[PDB]
Amino acid sequence: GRVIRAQRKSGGIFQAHTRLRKGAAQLRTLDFAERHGYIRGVVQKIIHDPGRGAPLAKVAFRNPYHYRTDVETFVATEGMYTGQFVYCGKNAALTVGNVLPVGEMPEGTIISNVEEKAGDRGALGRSSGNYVIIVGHDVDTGKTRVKLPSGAKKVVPSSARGVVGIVAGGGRIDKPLLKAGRAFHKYRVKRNCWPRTRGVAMNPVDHPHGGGNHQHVGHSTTVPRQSAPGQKVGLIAARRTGLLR
Amino acid sequence: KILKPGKVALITRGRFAGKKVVILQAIDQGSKSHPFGHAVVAGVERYPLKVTKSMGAKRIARRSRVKPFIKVVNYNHLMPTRYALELDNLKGLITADTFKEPTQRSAARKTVKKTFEEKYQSGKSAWFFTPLRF
Amino acid sequence: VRTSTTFRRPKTLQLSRKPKYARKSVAHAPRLDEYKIIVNPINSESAMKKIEDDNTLVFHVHLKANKFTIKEAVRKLYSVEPVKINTLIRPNGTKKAFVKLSADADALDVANRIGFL
């Protein structure tokens, strides 16, 4: 009878808390220097970005056209240290931290912050400890096949770039949170998504799951992909439920 | 022995940090007033300005004027280089007394200036006279 | 030949207003002059004591008079040089000014000459 908590997630009090953010983590804009050669930057500082599991690197590059210094916020890779030189471009060496086009890197290399399409400045393999693996090349069509952290294989333009190495901060989810307070603090610096009340504990007006004299769903929890926004709760378009016993 | 008279070195500490100097005399054994291995040097404080073929003679002289300085510097504060400067006319002018009486220090500064002026005009030691950017 | 990727709009000649007539037939007389600044002196017991002690006159002053216009109005109306002006808006919504006169003049004679004692 009322719109459900899922439907109210359109904005308002569910926005991301971005007061303490240390910059948007992006690659350099694909310019002439980075397309035909390489450009060197210095890692000024590695910092913690609240709401993010991976540390950020403040790499300072020289502007190739004007007398000033450009500072780029990168997703730090393991091994990055202050004062390390980072080379970005086609002729960059295959060293951890460098940025190269995926077409210039051999099969089986470990890369992160990969561009989906050359020029979007990083899309794939950015969470802490995640990476993308170069599976193969197709020179004739100028494409590169990569393996994503989810295991899905994707075809990307051979000019897409990616930072060599794995993202720093790996193993973050390996340690249990141990208490609701740690979950409380972890999610302050993120959106308003915690704590999560179950729909069975609500009323028929509050949720499709709510109601009854017992806490039961009352209907199959796998809903069609075509269901209305208010109906789309539970397991949406589930192809297979249950454990793999 | 790499700190010898006539060797170009860099001052790394003091007011004249990063200035190129020539080893005028080495007292590495030490002294009563300086118990360390010091070496008296003569260098440039105000490097001559860059000159252009389009410039007139008055400005060419005006920019080519160079302001020298004489200083006794510790070995640890000196950075020796491979470059060597031929210190003609500049062999015997510095002594402990030359520092004690500033009138000899003032005379030494003037002689060092006129030697640096002539050497700059002669076009020798281009690296010595160009400022070091850091 | 352009060495900058941006196109900034060019500067054009901006003629100044040269009207064919005046929008107002006659300019208004100064609407806040000396006589409208000073309404009347205050002659309460506290005002009298300020006269005899601090060499300070107390005036009922127009709301939109600042310390500068009060000083000139007093100088023009009374030919006395004030050394300080302190103003307050009384709880009834009227400005009151404490005009401290110079050491060369006394507020007593100024008060008698005005005639409000």
Partner: peptide
């Protein structure tokens, strides 16, 4: 020939000295 007139050539390669002012007419946001 004044010896003080020394040549200071600028390399304009990638990562070298700042790029000189060139004709960017075809890239102007008109």
């Amino acid at each position: 020939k004044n010896p003080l007139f020394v040549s200071r050539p600028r390399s304009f390669g990638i990562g070298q000295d700042i790029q000189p002012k060139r004709d960017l007419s075809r890239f102007v946001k008109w």
